[PDB]
Amino acid sequence: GPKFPRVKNWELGSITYDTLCAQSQQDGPCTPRRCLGSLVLPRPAEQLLSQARDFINQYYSSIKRSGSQAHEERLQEVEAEVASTGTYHLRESELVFGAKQAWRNAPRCVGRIQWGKLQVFDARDCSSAQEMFTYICNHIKYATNRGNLRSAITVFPQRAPGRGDFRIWNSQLVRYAGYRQQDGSVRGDPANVEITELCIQHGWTPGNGRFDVLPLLLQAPDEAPELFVLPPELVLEVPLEHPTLEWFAALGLRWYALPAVSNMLLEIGGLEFSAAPFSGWYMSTEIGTRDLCDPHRYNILEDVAVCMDLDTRTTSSLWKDKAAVEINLAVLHSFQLAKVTIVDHHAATVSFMKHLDNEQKARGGCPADWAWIVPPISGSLTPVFHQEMVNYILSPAFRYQPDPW
Amino acid sequence: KFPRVKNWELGSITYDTLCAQSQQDGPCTPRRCLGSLVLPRPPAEQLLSQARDFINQYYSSIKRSGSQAHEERLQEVEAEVASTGTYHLRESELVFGAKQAWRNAPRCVGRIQWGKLQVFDARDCSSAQEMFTYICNHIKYATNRGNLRSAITVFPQRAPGRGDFRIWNSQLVRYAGYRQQDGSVRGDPANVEITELCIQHGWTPGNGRFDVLPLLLQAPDEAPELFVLPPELVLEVPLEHPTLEWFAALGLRWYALPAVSNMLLEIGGLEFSAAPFSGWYMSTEIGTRDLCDPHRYNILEDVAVCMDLDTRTTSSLWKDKAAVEINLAVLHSFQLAKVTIVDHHAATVSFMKHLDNEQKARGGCPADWAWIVPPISGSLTPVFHQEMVNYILSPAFRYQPDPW
Ligand code: HEM
Ligand code: HEM
Ligand SMILES: Cc1cc(N)nc(CCc2cncc(CCc3cc(C)nc(N)c3)c2)c1
Ligand SMILES: Cc1cc(N)nc(CCc2cncc(CCc3cc(C)nc(N)c3)c2)c1
Ligand SMILES: C[C@H](O)[C@H](O)[C@H]1CNc2nc(N)[nH]c(=O)c2N1
Ligand SMILES: C[C@H](O)[C@H](O)[C@H]1CNc2nc(N)[nH]c(=O)c2N1
Ligand SMILES: [Zn+2]
Numbered sequence: 001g002p003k004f005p006r007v008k009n010w011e012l013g014s015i016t017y018d019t020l021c022a023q024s025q026q027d028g029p030c031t032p033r034r035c036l037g038s039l040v041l042p043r044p045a046e047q048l049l050s051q052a053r054d055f056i057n058q059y060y061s062s063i064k065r066s067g068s069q070a071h072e073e074r075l076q077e078v079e080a081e082v083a084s085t086g087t088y089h090l091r092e093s094e095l096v097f098g099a100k101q102a103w104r105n106a107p108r109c110v111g112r113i114q115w116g117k118l119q120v121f122d123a124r125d126c127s128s129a130q131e132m133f134t135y136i137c138n139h140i141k142y143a144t145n146r147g148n149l150r151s152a153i154t155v156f157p158q159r160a161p162g163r164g165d166f167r168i169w170n171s172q173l174v175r176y177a178g179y180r181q182q183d184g185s186v187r188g189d190p191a192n193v194e195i196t197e198l199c200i201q202h203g204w205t206p207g208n209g210r211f212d213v214l215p216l217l218l219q220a221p222d223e224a225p226e227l228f229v230l231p232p233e234l235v236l237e238v239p240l241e242h243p244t245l246e247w248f249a250a251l252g253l254r255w256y257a258l259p260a261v262s263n264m265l266l267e268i269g270g271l272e273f274s275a276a277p278f279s280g281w282y283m284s285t286e287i288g289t290r291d292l293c294d295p296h297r298y299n300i301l302e303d304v305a306v307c308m309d310l311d312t313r314t315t316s317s318l319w320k321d322k323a324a325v326e327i328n329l330a331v332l333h334s335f336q337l338a339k340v341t342i343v344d345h346h347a348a349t350v351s352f353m354k355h356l357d358n359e360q361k362a363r364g365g366c367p368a369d370w371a372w373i374v375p376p377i378s379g380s381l382t383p384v385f386h387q388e389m390v391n392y393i394l395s396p397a398f399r400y401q402p403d404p405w
Numbered sequence: 406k407f408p409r410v411k412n413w414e415l416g417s418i419t420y421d422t423l424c425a426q427s428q429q430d431g432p433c434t435p436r437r438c439l440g441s442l443v444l445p446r447p448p449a450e451q452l453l454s455q456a457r458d459f460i461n462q463y464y465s466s467i468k469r470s471g472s473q474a475h476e477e478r479l480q481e482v483e484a485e486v487a488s489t490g491t492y493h494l495r496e497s498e499l500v501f502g503a504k505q506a507w508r509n510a511p512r513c514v515g516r517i518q519w520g521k522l523q524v525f526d527a528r529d530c531s532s533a534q535e536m537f538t539y540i541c542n543h544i545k546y547a548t549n550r551g552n553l554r555s556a557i558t559v560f561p562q563r564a565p566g567r568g569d570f571r572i573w574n575s576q577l578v579r580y581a582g583y584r585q586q587d588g589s590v591r592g593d594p595a596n597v598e599i600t601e602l603c604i605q606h607g608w609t610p611g612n613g614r615f616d617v618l619p620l621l622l623q624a625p626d627e628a629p630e631l632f633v634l635p636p637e638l639v640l641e642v643p644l645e646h647p648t649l650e651w652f653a654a655l656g657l658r659w660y661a662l663p664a665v666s667n668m669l670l671e672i673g674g675l676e677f678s679a680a681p682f683s684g685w686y687m688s689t690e691i692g693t694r695d696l697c698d699p700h701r702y703n704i705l706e707d708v709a710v711c712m713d714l715d716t717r718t719t720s721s722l723w724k725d726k727a728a729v730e731i732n733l734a735v736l737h738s739f740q741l742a743k744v745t746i747v748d749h750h751a752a753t754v755s756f757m758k759h760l761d762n763e764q765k766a767r768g769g770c771p772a773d774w775a776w777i778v779p780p781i782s783g784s785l786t787p788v789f790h791q792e793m794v795n796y797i798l799s800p801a802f803r804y805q806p807d808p809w
Contacts, residue, residue: 005437005439005442006446007442008442008443010443010700011698011699011700012700018437021436021437024436024437027435027436028435028436028437028438029408029438030433030434030435030437030438030440031433031434031435032430032431032433032434033424033427033430033431033796034408034421034424034427034431034433034771034794034795034796035431035432035433035438035439035440035773035794035795035796036408036433036438036794037433037438037440037441037774037795038440038774038792038793038795039408039410039411039792040411040413040792043408043409289784289785290784293784293785294414294784294790295414296413296414296415296790301785315748315750315751315754316736316740316748316750316751317733318729318732318733318736318748318750320750320782320785321729321732321781321782321785322729324782324785325722325725325726325729328722328725329721329722332720332722336720344719344720344722346719346720346722346724347719347720350719370440370441370775371774371775371778374775374783375783376783376784376785376789377725377781377782377783377784377785378724378725378728378781378782379778379779379780379781379783380693380694380697380698380780380781381693381697381705381724381725381728381780381781385780386698386700388441388442388443389441390437390438390439390441391437391438391440391441392436392437392438
């Protein structure tokens with residue numbers, strides 16, 4: 001009967017309708033002719049104002065003051081600001097709300113049961129690259145909390161008309177260098193070849209390891225980016241070992257504790273925050289499956305399977321599956337032993353199912369990208385595999401933005 | 406306009422131009438994507454144009470596009486629709502249509518085999534009885550003593566004046582599921598409803614976890630009839646593990662032949678409501694979904710306990726360990742019984758080759774990422790990293806409502 005997407009869980013036979021998708025003001029890549037849902041990158045005053053009015057309504061709804069004189073006065077204040085300057089500015093509590101709502105709105109994130117618990121650092125007074133460094137360092141210390149990780153975001157000044165952006169050039173606050181070798185191969189993380197190359201061009205003295213922590217390249221408006229080395233005591237790392245396979249420790253593998261995205265745009269009511277790094281804690285499959293096993297990343301699957309003495313000559317020995325499970329167990333075990341927050345793909349997906357149910361009650365649906373929510377190993381072993389999902393763009397949002405170079 | 410399609414492992418890019426040939430809307434809109442939904446929510450002129458398009462596709466395929474044989478076949482079809490409201494396919498067109506429907510099937514990872522398909526014309530079938538004989542010959546043929554051969558059997562098309570020929574079973578071979586006094590199911594929990602129907606239409610039911618179901622076959626406007634498949638026609642494979650001796654003692658088994666029998670085959674406007682097809686299993690179907698899904702045989706915990714794993718916490722990854730052993734047991738057992746099977750690494754590698762063949766041949770390949778990517782070890786296969794466009798081309802297989 002309902003004129004909204006029916007959504008089914010094929011494990012439990014249960015049914016919901018997504019009414020929240022009606023709140024979407026922005027088109028994705030799909031059409032009735034063809035589905036483009038698996039694509040990683042989907043291809044003035046009037047416009048800003050309507051987006052602003054909409055965000056302010058969302059704000060006043062959330063504090064249950066919708067229709068009030070405080071609501072109408074804020075609306076009038078927002079338009080009067082746009083009337084004289086072309087832009088406007090958020091109140092502190094509006095920014096806190098917008099930031100949380102952007103995380104809550106992110107279809108690709110499985111960790112959203114935590115959305116209401118986000119420390120928002122307001123860094124809109126920041127006026128130099130040096131100050132950005134200070135702010136970022138404070139973020140890392142706060143977020144890392146000696147292993148007891150805490151979600152946080154730091155928000156730098158918003159994009160301004162005819163004035164350069166605040167930009168963090170790194171895609172993450174903590175990433176390993178990738179050194180292009182004389183024989184075409186790569187030492188370190190092949191994902192990070194360009195940023196490593198760019199850091200060196202900008203005066204970094206590079207190391208020669210597989211796990212060299214990259215420095216930050218930070219850009220303040222209309223200035224060239226400046227280079228900043230993170231003090232090693234600030235960057236918590238976990239040496240990797242396996243609970244039963246004694247040789248795994250001898251591989252000298254390690255990963256950083258803090259996953260912190262530094263290259264996304266945070267959009268709130270039309271306003272664009274080009275520098276706004278955020279951090280959580282890892283799901284173990286991100287490190288153990290993607291980072292360590294992708295053929296275009298550290299690519300350690302064969303090495304590990306050779307040590308495990310598997311038949312790597314034939315696919316049907318399932319050497320890849322076996323090695324990947326051990327690497328994942330080793331990631332989980334090492335983080336546990338070191339007392340660094342981590343969550344396995346089972347607990348995370350179970351917690352995402354709970355989140356789905358909370359959002360069904362609270363908002364009548366939850367935008368979710370199936371291909372990204374299902375983990376890269378043991379897919380159908382998790383409850384999210386059997387759960388249908390509707391994907392749409394709500395604002396506030398994190399958006400991908402082109403590399404600044 | 407034309408979507409850019411990228412492989413994120415290799416950095417390679419293609420453009421899908423095939424998608425402009427779609428005549429049938431899918432479930433997505435610019436406002437929201439519904440591509441993860443399993444099942445989302447004719448007058449002369451309209452059949453005539455699907456008919457012409459299909460005949461055009463066929464003469465193009467044999468490089469006689471524009472010949473007199475092509476002209477006269479278009480005239481035949483028009484003449485037949487214009488007087489009867491419908492028409493009939495020549496066997497050769499049927500053969501071409503069946504293969505093309507498989508080619509066009511976005512959820513199928515086995516499409517590298519698309520050109521190699523045995524097609525049995527069963528359109529001269531007039532009774533549940535005759536249906537049974539055809540199904541039995543299909544099975545004998547497809548099974549081929551473990552050396553599996555892809556096959557389809559096509560029963561008489563839908564006609565406006567009457568009910569459909571239908572196979573009630575969703576697959577030709579499936580295991581009974583008996584709902585038990587204490588709320589649990591013996592056998593396959595996915596087959597409870599179809600098992601109950603078989604009993605209501607007079608089957609004496611077994612009581613094991615692996616009792617092969619009888620077929621319920623329906624000729625137009627007649628009650629469905631029951632037929633037991635002769636035990637010797639149903640090749641089954643007992644499951645053992647290469648290294649774990651106690652696995653054999655789980656008493657696990659599975660049948661060789663995956664044969665879909667509830668799907669509708671659409672060719673050139675015509676609809677074939679009963680058109681069962683089969684190939685061979687990819688091991689993750691049995692090892693992961695059939696045995697490990699919690700609403701199926703759900704054996705994960707039993708296996709994990711046999712392996713003496715810590716079941717008390719998710720972080721020991723006991724589910725992932727056991728699943729892999731279960732999948733390995735399936736591959737080993739099929740190889741030992743000399744029954745055709747393919748693992749998900751081999752299958753996805755061959756699907757990648759298929760995408761490249763179709764790019765050159767047709768300028769695209771419709772594909773449903775969520776179905777192509779295996780249910781375990783997704784990103785360890787190359788399809789994970791491949792962007793895919795999904796859309797409906799005809800000829801096509803379609804879902805249809807259960808006949809009851
Ligand atoms: C608390 C623990 C958290 C967990 C376990 C988690 C988990 C994940 C995972 C597994 C992904 C996909 C990663 C990939 O495959 O590359 C992801 C993506 C994402 N996460 Fe979360 N996250 C957490 C916290 C956060 C926070 C605090 C934010 C923002 C405030 C956030 C926002 C996002 C966004 C925007 C994406 C998509 C990014 C992109 O498309 O590149 N997450 N998250
Ligand atoms: C030759 C060996 C074949 C292999 C290894 C194979 C593999 C697969 C797999 C793994 C699936 C998804 C199954 C699931 O998750 O339920 C599938 C679906 C499908 N296959 Fe293939 N297949 C083969 C042959 C065929 C043939 C001969 C046809 C038709 C002539 C066909 C048509 C289809 C269709 C229409 C689907 C979608 C089924 C649905 O929506 O329920 N396949 N195949
Ligand atoms: C806060 C947070 C927590 C967590 N557990 N994981 C993440 C993911 C970080 C991450 C790491 N590596 C890669 C990506 C994807 C980057 C990315 C790349 C492209 C091309 N498009 C996008 N939309 C996104 C994200 C973030
Ligand atoms: C020809 C062929 C070869 C092969 N290896 N596997 C198959 C899979 C058969 C198969 C088994 N169990 C379940 C399904 C899906 C059934 C199914 C169920 C529903 C509700 N909607 C759908 N679209 C499909 C298909 C077919
Ligand atoms: C082509 C495909 O969309 C792409 O590889 C996606 C699939 N799902 C993913 N899911 C997550 N969480 N992270 C990813 O990087 C990807 N990659
Ligand atoms: C909800 C989700 O789309 C559904 O569980 C799909 C996911 N991918 C699948 N892929 C295959 N091959 N077979 C399936 O049954 C499913 N199930
Ligand atoms: Zn879509």
